[PDB]
Amino acid sequence: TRKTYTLTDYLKNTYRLKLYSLRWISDHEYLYKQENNILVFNAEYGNSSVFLENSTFDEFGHSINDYSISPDGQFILLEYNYVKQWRHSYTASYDIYDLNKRQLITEERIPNNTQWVTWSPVGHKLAYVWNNDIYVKIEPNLPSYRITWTGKEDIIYNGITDWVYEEEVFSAYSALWWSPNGTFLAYAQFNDTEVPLIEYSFYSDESLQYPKTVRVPYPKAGAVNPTVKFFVVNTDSLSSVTNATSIQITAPASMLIGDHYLCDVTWATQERISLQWLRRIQNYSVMDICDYDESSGRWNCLVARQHIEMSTTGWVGRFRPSEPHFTLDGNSFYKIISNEEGYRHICYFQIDKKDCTFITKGTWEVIGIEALTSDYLYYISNEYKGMPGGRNLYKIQLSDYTKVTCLSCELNPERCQYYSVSFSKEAKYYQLRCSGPGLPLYTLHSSVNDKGLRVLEDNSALDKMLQNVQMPSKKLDFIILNETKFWYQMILPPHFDKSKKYPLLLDVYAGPCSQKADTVFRLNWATYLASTENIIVASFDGRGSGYQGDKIMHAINRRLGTFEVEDQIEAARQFSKMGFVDNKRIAIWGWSYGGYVTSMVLGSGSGVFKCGIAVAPVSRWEYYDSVYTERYMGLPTPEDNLDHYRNSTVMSRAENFKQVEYLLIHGTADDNVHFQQSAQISKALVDVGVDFQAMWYTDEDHGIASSTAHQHIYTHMSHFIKQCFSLP
Amino acid sequence: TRKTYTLTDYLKNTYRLKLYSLRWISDHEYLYKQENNILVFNAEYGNSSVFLENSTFDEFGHSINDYSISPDGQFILLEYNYVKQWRHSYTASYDIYDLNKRQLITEERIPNNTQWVTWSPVGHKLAYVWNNDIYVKIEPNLPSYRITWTGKEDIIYNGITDWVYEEEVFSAYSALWWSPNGTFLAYAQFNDTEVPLIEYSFYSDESLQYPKTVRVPYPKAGAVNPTVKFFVVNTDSLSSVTNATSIQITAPASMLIGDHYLCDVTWATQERISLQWLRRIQNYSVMDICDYDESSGRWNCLVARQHIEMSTTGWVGRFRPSEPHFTLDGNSFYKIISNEEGYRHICYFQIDKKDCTFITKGTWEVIGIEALTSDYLYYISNEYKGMPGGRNLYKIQLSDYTKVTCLSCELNPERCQYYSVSFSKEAKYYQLRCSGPGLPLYTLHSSVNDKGLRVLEDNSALDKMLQNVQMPSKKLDFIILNETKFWYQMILPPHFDKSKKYPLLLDVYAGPCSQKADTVFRLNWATYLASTENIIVASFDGRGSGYQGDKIMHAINRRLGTFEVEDQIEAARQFSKMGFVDNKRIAIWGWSYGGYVTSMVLGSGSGVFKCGIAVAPVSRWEYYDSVYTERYMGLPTPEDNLDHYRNSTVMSRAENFKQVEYLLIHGTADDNVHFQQSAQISKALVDVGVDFQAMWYTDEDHGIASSTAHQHIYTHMSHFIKQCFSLP
Ligand SMILES: CN(C)C(=O)[C@@H]([C@H]1CC[C@H](c2ccc3ncnn3c2)CC1)[C@H](N)C(=O)N1CCC(F)(F)C1
Ligand SMILES: CN(C)C(=O)[C@@H]([C@H]1CC[C@H](c2ccc3ncnn3c2)CC1)[C@H](N)C(=O)N1CCC(F)(F)C1
Ligand SMILES: *[C@@H]1O[C@H](CO)[C@@H](O[C@@H]2O[C@H](CO)[C@@H](O)[C@H](O)[C@H]2NC(C)=O)[C@H](O)[C@H]1NC(C)=O
Ligand SMILES: *[C@@H]1O[C@H](CO)[C@@H](O[C@@H]2O[C@H](CO)[C@@H](O)[C@H](O)[C@H]2NC(C)=O)[C@H](O)[C@H]1NC(C)=O
Ligand SMILES: *[C@@H]1O[C@H](CO)[C@@H](O[C@@H]2O[C@H](CO)[C@@H](O)[C@H](O)[C@H]2NC(C)=O)[C@H](O)[C@H]1NC(C)=O
Ligand SMILES: *[C@@H]1O[C@H](CO)[C@@H](O[C@@H]2O[C@H](CO)[C@@H](O)[C@H](O)[C@H]2NC(C)=O)[C@H](O)[C@H]1NC(C)=O
Ligand SMILES: *[C@@H]1O[C@H](CO)[C@@H](O[C@@H]2O[C@H](CO)[C@@H](O)[C@H](O)[C@H]2NC(C)=O)[C@H](O)[C@H]1NC(C)=O
Ligand SMILES: *[C@@H]1O[C@H](CO)[C@@H](O[C@H]2O[C@H](CO)[C@@H](O)[C@H](O)[C@H]2NC(C)=O)[C@H](O)[C@H]1NC(C)=O
Ligand SMILES: *[C@@H]1O[C@H](CO)[C@@H](O[C@H]2O[C@H](CO)[C@@H](O)[C@H](O)[C@H]2NC(C)=O)[C@H](O)[C@H]1NC(C)=O
Ligand SMILES: *[C@H]1O[C@H](CO)[C@@H](O[C@@H]2O[C@H](CO)[C@@H](O)[C@H](O)[C@H]2NC(C)=O)[C@H](O)[C@H]1NC(C)=O
Ligand SMILES: *[C@H]1O[C@H](CO)[C@@H](O[C@@H]2O[C@H](CO)[C@@H](O)[C@H](O)[C@H]2NC(C)=O)[C@H](O)[C@H]1NC(C)=O
Ligand SMILES: *[C@@H]1O[C@H](CO)[C@@H](O)[C@H](O)[C@H]1NC(C)=O
Ligand SMILES: *[C@@H]1O[C@H](CO)[C@@H](O)[C@H](O)[C@H]1NC(C)=O
Ligand SMILES: *[C@@H]1O[C@H](CO)[C@@H](O)[C@H](O)[C@H]1NC(C)=O
Ligand SMILES: *[C@@H]1O[C@H](CO)[C@@H](O)[C@H](O)[C@H]1NC(C)=O
Ligand SMILES: *[C@@H]1O[C@H](CO)[C@@H](O)[C@H](O)[C@H]1NC(C)=O
Ligand SMILES: *[C@@H]1O[C@H](CO)[C@@H](O)[C@H](O)[C@H]1NC(C)=O
Ligand code: NA
């Protein structure tokens, strides 16, 4: 008699997952917003105090988007007038409220339309970027010092990233890096002078008579890339009478010989900074370690302290060279790198030694290094039970690498197989965040003896609500292909009956280093399709997928649109051979990279799929950006890899769409995968006389996430899938 | 069983309609293309000779797109490298062939990318526009003389129209007018300096990496319009002076007080030119008649020869003030104008007398004046049988207006009721073109005795083919609403049975002065729908439609989106009451103004229609151009008609679309009705949570006429209609 999880439940968020987002402010306490109030918690005992009244700003007059308390707890930055730009970038207005004198600062306030702002790591200095230039405020109420004067819209970027560096390299708008104690402020400068612009229309509200043309410096594959320079400035010796002097750190000669990128910046100590550079041909990167010289006031990077990282099977790193984790004295560091077997493990480096030593090993991979103390290094890996889609927290004794302890594996194995972690300032405490297969579970622990102090949030409220719903189940397993196992997951309908034939929807992404088969608990479209429509929603990680070593991940190097596409068909083929699958009703769908694979599959002539949906897909690699595309495809020149760039397009397979039902969807204001990609797909289908379904979303970008568009797309796709499967 | 007229028959054009396109080159000879070669026929006897052998240019090195013989027959203009622009404009290359010498001229050649070229009306002078400047060639092989130096891409246009003048005013790209014997060359100059630009992307072939942004000076309703100036240069003086003076003829004071347009240029004699001007508020126009002053070399327009033409019920003219037809001596002229009853009839004017004399009258209208001789005036009207949808040729004796003979009415009344005509150079002969209700019939006649000389093309071949096909029948009739007749037509399925209930498709356009109910024979989408799908396709001409007097035409003055929308809904009801229509299956569809009406109807909440298709619709009048929009809606300001502008949008009825099935279609490169218009409709529908069907056509314009796209859109629309009507 109980209800199912419906489309409306998914769209209106009827069943909400509770979270516990805390912010560590020291090694013993953290901030947590409750009832709109900000409380400070003592980790050891769990007791709290109110830190900021949810009414303190009742007469502020502005809607506060977010807040940020200075490291010393003396000030709070109030963010408002938020205006989103790309994936991470946005502008906003700011105000600083003095917590000591319980007063709002009105003198020398941060400008409106500020592009980025950040407190120093210690104390209360500020650094913000406005009009592409960097500014520093030693005190919240004092006048700021201008650090750069070359800032120019769409041309010169000081302290912030341009489009491609924001999206593909740093995953952030900021290009500012404070030294550990706030003395130095390092920053990058980007020059997009010769980078072509992508142009597309923006219609805006109906009142706008003429559509606006948006123009963004965006380097497509093979095009001219922005250039980059790196600087360091001493914020302790700034003058009101003299323009701040920034010291430049140039990239190594092996980098200056041609196009290159700055791919990582990590401080080692108060006077030592490391930088990793990557060549445009992303199989070779160099780390420079630089020390501040009090005599010349310059930064020297000893050649003997250089570290090269290259790859012979593919590119370097998962999406970019990994970041180094320096020890207290900065004389050595730990870094995740691909080992001789092609598995990513932690290597220990001496700053002036070429050979590093691997401290972990095995047919599994370290996902990331989470914390470092003189006795232990904490990290997350998918080692447990050999499940590449599981994640657990481990610590390894630095004095004896044979001593590895899993800290989360056995806490609750049935409910928790995928963890994330948050350590306090000195790793004295850590918060564990279990996200599956059962309902999310947040706990707090102490490092000295790894005690489980308390449960922060167990989602018992949601568990109670879900008891009255017929929820689908999840099967995570694998199939073998040529001696190699590949994992898949299936979202199975309630009361699954293996003696019946169920329609099947293959949910695919399949980009390089992707993972779609995991132990994560999710309430999404697939939950509804399985719960209400009785559709099996499956996903498969084939060649090119991540966290299983380079042999699998690099199989598609310089060859996108091949093995990862073929493997999805092979998986479907195998699923169709299963007793509970109706081989007459198998569909496939994907978004972004997933739209591309779905389209390449439907245009393969395999005959396995009856219909498919591609959302904002890539259609030909020459249309996507250089940093991501070239990493996997090299350059599109006859001397490099043009032939495959031309053989891996969706358009060339148009004719094969005659035997399938295809729905193509795309937002007109997509700054990431340009509408162009879908406009070329539709034109090729028209040119060979193939009928298909389409839907454009006016002014929506790659996320098609505005509330109304989101509901509209999923509603439209549901009708399409049900119609394809002959479902009432 | 006889096969029916299928979708493939329409898309593949299996039943080809033959025609007979001839070009008069004198008072008794015409050119005709047969077997790909150009023949010259003697009108009087029907005999001919090969004018230009099809192999004459087998090694020209290019595909000849079109040709043009100079009036004196001494040269032939060869046009190639045709590159289409808007509805009438295009660029091309040209070569000139000396017919006597049989050689292709190779010196002082017309430039590539020439915007327009035209022979002088007599002899073989040439005037062409290149890079927006006018040039004149006295002899085909000699250097040309530059006439203007102000030419400026998208800014200053000399001798050619800008976008809005091309589309809405002159229906042509050229803006130059040779005087009768070719001595003078008159021309307009348009300045779009402050006209806003419509911008949209053009994706082009898949090889183009970055989309192209098309930018066109296009004035939307209420925006800054281009300004205009008129000039006349004496070409006979070009070889005598270094820089011949272009004498300007200024607009009258009545026009200079505000924004205005040049709407007509017509030469009266070798030394008399007439021009008509129109105020931005299109209900007042002025015609100046200007004489060349041999002593000053200037042009003077005597105010006593100025003619005013204003309208109290609407705008002036059907789409623009009508053109004058001067008698040989240039002292009088005939012009079609709305009489006191609102019916358009021929008025005879003395050039220096303001009151004119109507020479025709009645409750019908004159469509156009086709020829004028010293004794007779020939015109086309819908007088016959009081059928506003019919057209016939008439002759009226200039010395006795009571003597009016219909030259086409009785030729073949059952087969022919819609005629157009083509007179020889001095009207000695005329070709009659019958286009319906039966198969087109082309005949040649002698003006001296109005006797038929012979049949040129009777379409016997097609008639034979259609014998084996179950063709639909067509009904043209009227219904009385408010004691006034409103015509409609219905394409009826074969073997129609008034005792059955047929699904009905309302084919609508309904813009001002439109006519969708007529006696023309058509082989189109509706033919297939009726013949194969047994669907009744109907059209109705309600308030706002033309050729029936101003009472009906001006009924929507300043009120677009009202009566013409309601009458369409009311027509469906009336059709329901006819008894052979299935009220559960009534659909509506239209293109352009038609897409707008369709959308307005589907959003009216009438409950009458089940589904509808809007192709390239207008969605809000402020997005359409100034000249057309303001003519019917006035200005979008609070002091004028802004409230109705804001009240007649499709977007404000979004909520009502929940009651119907909608398919929205638009070409992305539509320079006329911008994609913007459908982008706002879709957004408004997404915003209120309405599901609908959509389809964009990459790089197609308002005509979506490319071969592949054309077949694709009609195939897509057929599936939608059949599905809505539950048809196999
Ligand atoms: C899965 N996601 C969100 C991504 O791949 C995006 C990016 C997400 C951030 C990644 C990135 C960058 C640095 C870094 N350092 C550590 N992790 N890490 C991850 C790079 C790829 C990618 N730029 C994108 O939007 N695409 C659309 C077309 C496409 F499919 F083809 C790629
Ligand atoms: C029916 N047609 C083809 C037209 O109305 C078009 C034009 C065709 C030429 C006419 C024109 C101009 C001068 C003239 N002189 C004599 N006849 N004549 C006709 C004006 C209207 C109009 N500019 C158009 O494209 N619209 C799309 C949106 C819209 F529906 F709202 C109007
Ligand atoms: C942050 O670290 C810097 C660098 O070590 C410290 O600055 C040095 O301080 C010493 C002692 O006062 C001076 O002798 C040096 O000349 C300083 N060097 C530079 C480059 O400024 C700074 O004191 C530290 N700041 C904090 C807050 O601890
Ligand atoms: C059509 O045929 C007539 C004869 O039937 C041709 O007439 C010739 O006309 C020229 C003048 O142009 C005379 O000098 C000839 O003597 C006429 N010949 C005859 C036999 O009468 C006429 O040229 C033909 N026209 C075409 C285009 O072929
Ligand atoms: C086209 O129109 C523009 C006005 O919109 C003219 O430009 C002006 O020209 C004057 C005279 O030289 C200048 O002082 C102004 O600065 C110009 N205004 C603008 C907005 O540009 C232009 O001269 C006209 N061109 C022609 C050939 O008539
Ligand atoms: C031919 O005459 C026209 C008209 O005087 C010249 O055009 C003028 O050129 C001057 C200087 O180049 C400008 O300051 C004026 O604004 C122009 N007037 C017009 C109406 O365009 C043209 O330059 C002359 N050509 C030659 C070769 O002398
Ligand atoms: C075309 O018409 C023009 C204008 O009437 C003729 O040129 C005039 O010719 C007369 C002689 O008959 C002269 O007195 C005038 O000076 C000319 N006027 C101008 C403006 O040039 C021209 O001769 C006619 N062309 C032909 C071939 O008859
Ligand atoms: C949590 O509880 C402790 C007491 O158990 C609070 O007290 C500590 O800090 C106070 C002021 O900062 C001192 O008055 C106490 O002496 C000190 N306790 C000890 C044992 O030294 C602590 O402040 C509380 N934290 C919060 C956030 O409320
Ligand atoms: C940003 O890059 C540009 C171009 O790469 C630098 O300018 C150089 O390139 C120009 C081409 O547009 C040349 O014309 C210039 O001579 C050359 N140098 C200068 C000073 O323009 C530009 O300087 C860079 N800007 C910064 C702040 O580094
Ligand atoms: C950024 O913009 C805000 C909003 O305009 C500025 O705050 C004041 O806003 C009021 C109206 O809300 C205006 O009357 C004032 O002119 C604005 N300025 C001041 C000083 O009152 C704010 O000042 C701007 N910030 C900066 C750094 O210019
Ligand atoms: C990283 O990959 C690149 C690209 O495959 C290698 O560069 C060369 O690639 C070309 C084809 O573009 C081949 O002909 C060469 O054999 C490759 N090697 C060289 C030295 O040119 C590059 O070698 C790889 N780098 C590493 C360190 O393995
Ligand atoms: C803070 O404001 C919110 C407004 O939604 C209110 O619900 C909450 O109770 C307030 N906090 C306290 C402690 O009253
Ligand atoms: C700082 O540099 C900028 C830009 O070069 C200059 O305009 C300004 O006057 C300088 N100020 C001082 C104090 O040198
Ligand atoms: C092994 O399997 C892979 C796919 O997993 C296939 O591409 C390959 O051709 C097979 N053979 C060998 C020798 O690897
Ligand atoms: C004219 O050329 C065509 C080819 O397009 C050819 O078929 C025909 O024979 C030629 N004309 C004559 C009279 O032969
Ligand atoms: C037109 O362009 C072609 C190709 O660029 C060139 O060969 C030819 O000479 C040009 N003709 C003229 C008249 O400029
Ligand atoms: C012309 O139209 C305007 C706008 O409606 C109107 O105010 C004016 O009176 C009209 N003039 C005539 C003669 O009808
Ligand atoms: Na506990």
Side-chain angles (χ1 to χ4, degrees), chain B residues 150 156 189 191 193-194 229:
Chain B
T150 53
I156 307 307
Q189 178 191 81
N191 189 328
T193 295
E194 290 170 290
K229 292 179 179 184

Side-chain angles (χ1 to χ4, degrees), chain B residues 450-693:
Chain B
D450 292 309
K451 293 298 122 180
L453 302 171
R454 62 194 152 276
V455 174
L456 297 168
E457 173 64 64
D458 60 14
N459 271 294
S460 58
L462 171 59
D463 174 66
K464 192 198 186 304
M465 287 180 87
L466 292 187
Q467 308 281 50
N468 320 293
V469 185
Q470 293 196 54
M471 296 300 281
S473 65
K474 175 174 178 178
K475 182 186 173 54
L476 171 64
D477 203 3
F478 62 90
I479 60 166
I480 297 178
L481 297 172
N482 275 45
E483 291 189 349
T484 141
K485 303 172 203 173
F486 286 107
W487 296 72
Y488 72 84
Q489 63 172 45
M490 283 184 178
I491 304 303
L492 303 166
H495 308 131
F496 178 66
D497 181 357
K498 68 190 304 285
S499 86
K500 297 188 193 181
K501 297 289 186 184
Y502 292 84
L504 194 160
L505 176 53
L506 187 56
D507 180 332
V508 50
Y509 183 71
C513 201
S514 68
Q515 184 170 72
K516 289 280 285 176
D518 60 35
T519 68
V520 174
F521 172 83
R522 299 181 181 89
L523 287 182
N524 57 17
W525 189 47
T527 310
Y528 145 70
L529 294 177
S531 177
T532 301
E533 305 305 336
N534 298 138
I535 291 171
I536 295 176
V537 184
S539 295
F540 182 80
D541 290 326
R543 282 170 289 179
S545 57
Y547 314 110
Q548 301 158 76
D550 286 346
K551 168 72 173 290
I552 288 176
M553 195 168 79
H554 295 170
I556 55 180
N557 184 223
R558 293 169 65 75
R559 249 50 183 174
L560 299 189
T562 60
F563 298 141
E564 82 281 23
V565 177
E566 306 166 69
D567 292 356
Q568 214 56 211
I569 295 168
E570 180 53 37
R573 288 180 187 120
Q574 294 289 312
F575 297 146
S576 300
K577 296 178 181 178
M578 298 199 162
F580 48 67
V581 174
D582 180 353
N583 282 219
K584 297 182 302 292
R585 294 142 89 215
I586 300 182
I588 181 180
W589 97 280
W591 194 313
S592 191
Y593 200 103
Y596 170 63
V597 169
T598 288
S599 304
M600 289 290 274
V601 165
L602 291 168
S604 73
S606 86
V608 178
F609 306 83
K610 178 176 186 166
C611 58
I613 306 174
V615 186
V618 161
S619 64
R620 82 138 38 175
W621 290 109
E622 277 155 290
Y623 300 156
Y624 203 58
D625 72 68
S626 59
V627 182
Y628 178 100
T629 311
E630 292 167 21
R631 182 151 69 232
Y632 313 106
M633 294 285 278
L635 293 173
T637 65
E639 313 86 316
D640 191 350
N641 204 32
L642 174 61
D643 290 349
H644 184 64
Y645 260 95
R646 294 301 165 66
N647 218 227
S648 58
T649 75
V650 165
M651 285 69 80
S652 62
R653 292 144 87 120
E655 189 71 25
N656 289 312
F657 278 79
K658 279 166 176 169
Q659 304 172 59
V660 306
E661 287 162 49
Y662 184 52
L663 169 53
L664 177 62
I665 305 174
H666 212 133
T668 65
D670 198 320
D671 52 285
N672 193 336
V673 174
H674 312 320
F675 185 76
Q676 157 194 44
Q677 307 230 35
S678 290
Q680 292 289 4
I681 286 170
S682 65
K683 183 153 55 66
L685 291 173
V686 171
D687 281 21
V688 296
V690 179
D691 185 51
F692 61 103
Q693 298 279 85

Side-chain angles (χ1 to χ4, degrees), chain A residues 13-31:
Chain A
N13 302 290
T14 301
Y15 299 106
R16 206 182 315 292
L17 291 158
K18 276 175 174 164
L19 285 63
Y20 200 92
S21 299
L22 59 74
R23 309 179 183 194
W24 290 110
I25 61 175
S26 69
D27 197 44
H28 321 263
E29 305 193 306
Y30 68 81
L31 299 178

